[PDB]
Design a protein around this ligand. Structure first.
Ligand SMILES: [Ca+2]
Ligand SMILES: [Zn+2]
Lengths: 378, 346
């Protein structure tokens, strides 16, 4: 309910004074029950122990900068960043839904006291959300951005007997109440150096915990977890940048296949997916090394437009929100085009166009009452 | 002592602390841009000329056989004058890794002021130095041959003590001295008893058979010792021999900028004295055939910005010319990214 820590105190003391018996707990007893849900409260052990990852079990909110030496003699870095670890966050994310996975185990006709090799499916996402500041001093022209790296649990599955069963599935995945934050920072989403400097430890932990098992008591008896990480919640610009392709204005378009727009526009629909992450990496390698002693203009074509070192293993797939918005604005422009009937008389100038837009917007506001907007919303 | 203000072209946002300025036969080039090489310029290296205080960072092109190299942000560069070429080592790639290759770069063709570089990836064999940054490399002649002396700087923790709670922490490297043979790129380590602390961001001069190492930040103790060291070297028929000496007349500065004002005489400019005390006074280093000294010169005039800013950076241009940058306040009417100045001595 977005209350404060003093307004709540107001409510608490007034209720307790009016009706004698207390109905809301004090603040200290609220914090003591807060601790049992934040990450880094429970024992858990890896098998085998994760290389490069510490063994402690009492790490809370770690400084995101990862002990980055920042002295004037070195690169000037000023952003702020906070994070959890990755295991200490997955542990808590599982142990809060303990009851909701046990209930599924019951409903699916399974002996509750089971400790099979559970497998979690975790969707990873990231998207800059700039313009977060405020002109508290009433002085304008001062922007700032931010970045949040967050994940989600989406399916918990055990292999009972001959096949697997969906012990848990997510009701409404892409909503705002079932995606858990993992780190956040104040840096422009394109400040590549700072971005990598902050997001490298997360990928370190993520690649570490991909060939191990987590043993952890789950409602009494101990159980064993293993994970799968699919990184999908990346818009177009991020997946274009961090995976190491030329920017969106390239002749190369599809983040999944290697075709130029002047070629997909002709071979309409017969493609596949042929741009993985390891292929991307070895292709950047053959770029950097240039073993064939060939010029740039054909080397770029040989390496299908890779010019940087990708540092995040991300699976490729179309986004939904931005795809629908793009299609919408797309055929809105085709409407505005069909006002001028340019198919009959082509090549009009950029004043007939503004007139067409004004006529369309006014007619729509008169007929369907669709308000005028510059930045289209879903 | 001729400070001069400078204005810049449109793509000012390719200037980042820790670039490199390679001076090829009068022409000068800028290397180590910010962010990976955009599609406007696939090589990330520019012809960097300046007329009437307006500079035009133009794209450069490579050869048919060069090794397209990432933009390093704090490498070790030296002027291998044996044709004229440049040696680059290590540095810190955009994705915050650390390289460990040698990059030998020269000009394959410059016709009608249309340059064309070529660079090669020379690899070290033997007791190779670990990948690190901020270190220094110099080339030195003796008995008609030459060798590259390398003094290490700082680097990441070794590949065992990497933990993701201090994953981006750095420590100095063991103060060895690495002798590198460029004819075959072979590496030989050497231990010397006169040097104790690990040194970073120091200044390395090469008097044709003897290298002088001055200044430097000692991370192991967060102090900047005034210990200047002379290093004599000789390569006999077999394995070479190295010797160190300590001489008086020290100075305490870190991340200083060197240039050659006169033959056998250099000037050194403001790096940093303390982490809160910048360096406003410059020092003339009087080299010599066998002895050297360091005096304080007439503090070339600054402005409100430089004397008021918190940091600075830059490098030399080669012909007795320094390029410096300044952050520039942001709590104003949306000031530019950086401001700039050019220092001359004539
Ligand atoms: Ca976005
Ligand atoms: Zn496609």
């Amino acid at each position: 309910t977005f209350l404060s820590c003093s307004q709540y105190h107001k409510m608490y003391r007034t209720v307790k004074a009016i009706t004698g018996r207390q109905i809301f707990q004090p603040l200290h007893a609220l914090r003591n029950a807060e601790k049992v849900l934040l990450p880094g409260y429970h024992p858990f052990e890896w098998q085998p122990p994760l290389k490069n990852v510490s063994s402690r079990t009492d790490v809370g909110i770690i400084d995101g900068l990862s002990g980055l030496a920042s002295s004037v003699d070195e690169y000037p870095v000023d952003t702020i960043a906070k994070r959890f670890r990755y295991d200490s966050a997955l542990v808590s994310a599982l142990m809060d839904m303990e009851e909701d996975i046990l209930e599924g185990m019951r409903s699916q006709d399974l002996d509750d006291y089971l400790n099979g090799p559970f497998t979690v499916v975790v969707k990873e996402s990231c998207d800059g959300m700039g313009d977060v500041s405020e002109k508290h001093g009433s002085g304008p022209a001062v922007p700032e951005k931010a970045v949040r790296f967050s994940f989600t649990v989406m399916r918990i599955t055990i292999e009972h007997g001959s096949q697997n069963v969906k012990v848990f599935e997510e009701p409404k995945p892409n909503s705002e109440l079932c995606c858990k934050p993992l780190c956040l920072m104040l840096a422009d989403e394109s400040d590549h150096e700072t971005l990598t400097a902050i997001l490298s430890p997360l990928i370190a932990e993520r690649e570490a915990m991909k060939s191990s098992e987590l043993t952890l008591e789950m409602g009494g008896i101990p159980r064993t977890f293993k994970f799968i990480f699919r990184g999908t919640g990346y818009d177009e610009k991020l997946v274009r940048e961090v995976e190491g392709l030329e920017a969106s204005g390239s002749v190369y378009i599809c983040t999944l296949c290697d075709t130029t727009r002047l070629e997909a526009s002709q071979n309409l629909v017969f493609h596949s997916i042929t741009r993985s992450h390891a292929e991307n990496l070895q292709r950047y390698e053959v770029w950097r090394s240039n073993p064939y002693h060939e010029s740039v203009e054909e080397l770029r074509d040989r390496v299908k437009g890779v010019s940087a070192k990708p540092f995040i293993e991300t699976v490729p797939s179309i986004d939904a929100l931005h795809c629908d918005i793009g299609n919408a604005a797309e055929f809105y422009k085709i409407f505005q085009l069909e006002i001028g009937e340019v198919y009959k008389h082509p090549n009009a100038s950029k004043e007939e166009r503004k007139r067409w837009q004004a006529t369309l917007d006014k007619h729509l506001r008169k007929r369907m009452n669709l308000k005028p907007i510059m930045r289209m919303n879903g | 002592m001729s400070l001069q203000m400078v204005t810049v072209g449109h793509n000012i946002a390719l200037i980042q602390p820790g670039f490199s300025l390679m001076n090829f036969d009068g022409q000068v080039f800028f290397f180590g841009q910010k962010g990976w090489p955009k599609r406007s310029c696939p090589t990330g290296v520019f012809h960097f000329d300046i007329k009437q205080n307006h500079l035009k960072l133009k794209p450069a092109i490579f050869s048919k056989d060069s090794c397209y190299l990432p933009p390093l942000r704090y490498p070790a560069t030296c002027s291998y004058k044996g044709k004229h070429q440049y040696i680059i080592h290590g540095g810190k790639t955009p994705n915050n890794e650390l390289s460990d290759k040698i990059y030998i770069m020269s000009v394959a063709c410059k016709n009608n002021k249309k340059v064309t570089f070529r660079c090669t990836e020379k690899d070290l064999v033997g007791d190779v130095p670990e990948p690190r940054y901020g270190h220094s490399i110099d080339v030195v002649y003796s008995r008609g041959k030459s060798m590259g002396v390398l003094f290490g700087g700082r680097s990441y923790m070794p590949s065992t003590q990497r933990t993701t709670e201090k994953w981006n922490s750095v420590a100095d490297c063991l103060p060895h001295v690495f002798l590198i043979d460029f004819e075959f790129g072979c590496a030989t380590s050497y231990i010397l008893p006169e040097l104790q602390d690990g040194l970073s961001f120091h200044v390395s001069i090469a008097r044709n058979d003897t290298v002088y190492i001055l200044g430097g930040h000692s991370l192991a103790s967060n102090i900047r010792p005034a210990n200047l060291y002379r290093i004599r070297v000789d390569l006999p028929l077999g394995t070479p021999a190295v010797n160190c000496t300590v001489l008086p007349g020290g100075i305490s500065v870190s991340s200083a900028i060197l240039t050659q004002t006169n033959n056998d005489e250099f000037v050194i400019v403001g790096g940093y004295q303390l982490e809160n005390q910048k360096r406003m006074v410059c020092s003339l280093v009087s080299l010599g055939d066998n002895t050297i000294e360091i005096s304080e010169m007439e503090t070339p005039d600054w402005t409100s910005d430089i004397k008021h800013s918190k940091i600075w950076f830059g490098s030399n241009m080669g012909n007795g010319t320094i390029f410096l940058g300044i952050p520039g306040d942001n709590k104003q009417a949306m000031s530019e990214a950086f401001y700039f100045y050019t220092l001359r001595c004539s």
